[PDB]
Structure 1
Amino acid sequence: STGSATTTPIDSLDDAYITPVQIGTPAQTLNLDFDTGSSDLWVFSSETTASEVDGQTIYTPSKSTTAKLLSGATWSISYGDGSSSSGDVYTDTVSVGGLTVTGQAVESAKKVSSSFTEDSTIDGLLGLAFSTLNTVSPTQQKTFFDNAKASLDSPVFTADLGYHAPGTYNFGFIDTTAYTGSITYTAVSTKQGFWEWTSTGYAVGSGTFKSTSIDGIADTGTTLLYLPATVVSAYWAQVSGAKSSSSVGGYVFPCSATLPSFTFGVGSARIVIPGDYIDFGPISTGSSSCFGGIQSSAGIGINIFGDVALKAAFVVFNGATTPTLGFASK
């Protein structure tokens, strides 16, 4: 089997991407944030505290004839932006782009934090990191990908995120028309439950490539590119007037600037992030200071190849017995 679904930026800045997902019988279609950095499939629901729902589409398990409460199971998750959510658990049928999993754990939110409430475009998350990170207790549950994997033509999914444009998540096959050149594969460590890999280095604009190992994660659920302070300083030094602003919370730059590209290494291959992908617009409405899309990972503890980086590539998440990651230009 295979599945294929279009993923769409939630706003004009590509702050996140949503992908329609069918849950239950009859189907309830929710727009979920596919997140290769976490491992819970959770949704706004008829159980979510009413004051914490503001425009999202909800899952109502009592209207799904295939929903079953998972007895005694709860979940609770926190994300690196300070957000969180928690609730109870159903199993139900979940389909993405024509690929169907029966008995998927669907984590129904009873509580969500303010950032989730304030984002009316995101009805929940679909985690695509390794199932070892799933938060359901007392019996951990499997991700959608893990449940689908044995039925897929090939045990893979691909992320093709657009810049200011739709894109695609495919399950079970590699669309050889969706990229240019070849796919370079690189080793993955699952020891932290992430799609963790080592980039071979970077370049800023037309500058010389610096060969240096950068361990980080391929994370579709994080917007920005978070890299070591030395690397980020080298990037912003090429943008006249850019500064790290403690009040704003990272590097900002004059909105009139033209940003240089940023290249990262995948083995001997190179992925070029165009400068425009690094512009996240005015820091507040009407300001002429703009937020940068490359920020220091110093306070995180891991480097994160978020959407800024991934959207410059066609990315293969290879879930074979020894997982690997593939990157191609596109």
Structure 2
Amino acid sequence: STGSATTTPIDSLDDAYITPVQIGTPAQTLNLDFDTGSSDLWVFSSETTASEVDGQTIYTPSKSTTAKLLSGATWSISYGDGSSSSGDVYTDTVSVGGLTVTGQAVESAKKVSSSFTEDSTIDGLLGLAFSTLNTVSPTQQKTFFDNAKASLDSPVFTADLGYHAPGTYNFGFIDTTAYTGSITYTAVSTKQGFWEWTSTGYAVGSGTFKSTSIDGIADTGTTLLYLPATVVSAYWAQVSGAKSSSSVGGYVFPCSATLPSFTFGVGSARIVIPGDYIDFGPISTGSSSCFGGIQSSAGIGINIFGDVALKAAFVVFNGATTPTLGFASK
């Protein structure tokens, strides 16, 4: 089997991407944030504290003839950005782009933190990291990909995120028309539960490539590119007037600037992030100070190849017995 679904930016900055997911019988379609940095499929629901729902579409398990309470199971998750959610668990039928999993754990939120409430466009998350990170207790549950894998034509999924435009998540096949050149594959460590890999270096604009190992994670659920302070300083030094602002919480730059590109290495291959991908717009409405899309990972504890990086590539998440990651230009 295979599946193919369009993923759409939630706003004009590409702050996140939503993908429609069918849950239950009859189908209830929710727009979920596909997150290769976590491993829970959770949704706003009829069980969510009413004051914490503000415009989201909810899953109502009582209206699904295939929903079953997973007795005794609870979940609770906290994300890198400080947000969180928790609740109980159903199993139900879940379909993405024509690919169906029966008996998928659907984690129903009883509580969500303010940032989730405040974002009316995201109805929940669909985790695509390794199932070892799944938070369901006392019996850990599998991700949608893990459940689908054996049925897929090939045990892979691909992320093709757009810049200021829709893109695609495919399951079970590689669309050879969706990228240019070849796909370069690189080793993955699953020891921390992430799609963790090592970039071979970077360049800023038309500058020379610096060969240096940068361990980090491929994370579709993180907006920005978080890299070591040395790398980030070298980038922003090429932008007149750019500075790190403790009050804003990262590097800012004059909105009048033209930003240089940023290149990262995948083996001997190179992925180029155009400068415009690095512009996240005014820090507050009407400001002429703009927020940068490349930020320091210092104090995160890990480098993160988030959407800013991934959207410059066609990315293969290869879930073979020994997982690997592939990157192509597009």
Is the pair's TM-score, using the shorter chain for normalization, greater than 0.5? yes
Alignment partners' CA distance in 1, 2:51 and 2:286: 30
Structure 2 unaligned blocks of 5 or more: none
Alignment partners' CA distance in 1, 2:150 and 2:246: 48
Alignment partners' CA distance in 2, 1:250 and 1:21: 34
- Aligned match of 1:41: 41
3-state SS of 1:192 partner:
coil
Alignment partners' CA distance in 1, 2:117 and 2:258: 34
Q: CA deviation at 1:106?
A: 0.1
Alignment partners' CA distance in 1, 2:156 and 2:104: 18
3-state SS of 1:232 partner:
helix
3-state SS of 2:14 partner:
coil
Which digits, 9 at most, give the CA deviation of each residue in 1:161-207, with x for residues without a partner?
Answer: 00000000000000000000000000000000000000000000000
Alignment partners' CA distance in 1, 2:152 and 2:8: 24
Q: CA deviation at 1:255?
A: 0.2
- Aligned match of 1:74: 74
Following TM superposition, the consecutive aligned residue runs of length 4 or more in structure 1 with deviations greater than 6 angstroms are none
Tell me whether 1:276 sits opposite 2:276 in the alignment. Answer: yes
Q: CA deviation at 1:54?
A: 0.2
- Aligned match of 2:260: 260
3-state SS of 1:39 partner:
coil
3-state SS of 2:203 partner:
strand
Q: CA deviation at 1:121?
A: 0.2
Q: CA deviation at 1:299?
A: 1.3
3-state SS of 1:116 partner:
helix
Alignment partners' CA distance in 2, 1:247 and 1:82: 18
Which digits, 9 at most, give the CA deviation of each residue in 1:201-228, with x for residues without a partner?
Answer: 0000000000000000000000000000
Alignment partners' CA distance in 1, 2:291 and 2:72: 44
Alignment partners' CA distance in 1, 2:313 and 2:30: 26
Q: CA deviation at 1:86?
A: 0.1
Identity of aligned residues (%): 100
Alignment partners' CA distance in 2, 1:53 and 1:123: 10
Alignment partners' CA distance in 1, 2:10 and 2:179: 23
Alignment partners' CA distance in 2, 1:30 and 1:256: 38
Alignment partners' CA distance in 2, 1:80 and 1:166: 25
Q: CA deviation at 1:144?
A: 0.0
Where in structure 2 are the equivalents of 1:89-238 lying within 5 Å? 89-238=89-238
Alignment partners' CA distance in 2, 1:199 and 1:229: 16
3-state SS of 2:316 partner:
strand
Q: CA deviation at 1:119?
A: 0.3
Calculate the TM-score normalised by the size of structure 1. Answer: 1.00
3-state SS of 1:115 partner:
helix
Which digits, 9 at most, give the CA deviation of each residue in 1:135-160, with x for residues without a partner?
Answer: 00000000000000000000000000
Alignment partners' CA distance in 2, 1:282 and 1:299: 25
Calculate the TM-score normalised by the size of structure 2. Answer: 1.00
Alignment partners' CA distance in 2, 1:237 and 1:151: 49
Alignment partners' CA distance in 2, 1:257 and 1:249: 20
3-state SS of 1:148 partner:
helix
Structure 1 unaligned blocks of 5 or more: none
Alignment partners' CA distance in 2, 1:37 and 1:137: 19
Which digits, 9 at most, give the CA deviation of each residue in 1:264-312, with x for residues without a partner?
Answer: 0000000000000000000000000000000000010000000000000
- Aligned match of 2:22: 22
The count of corresponding residues between Structure 1 and Structure 2 is 330
Which digits, 9 at most, give the CA deviation of each residue in 1:97-126, with x for residues without a partner?
Answer: 000000000000000000000000000000
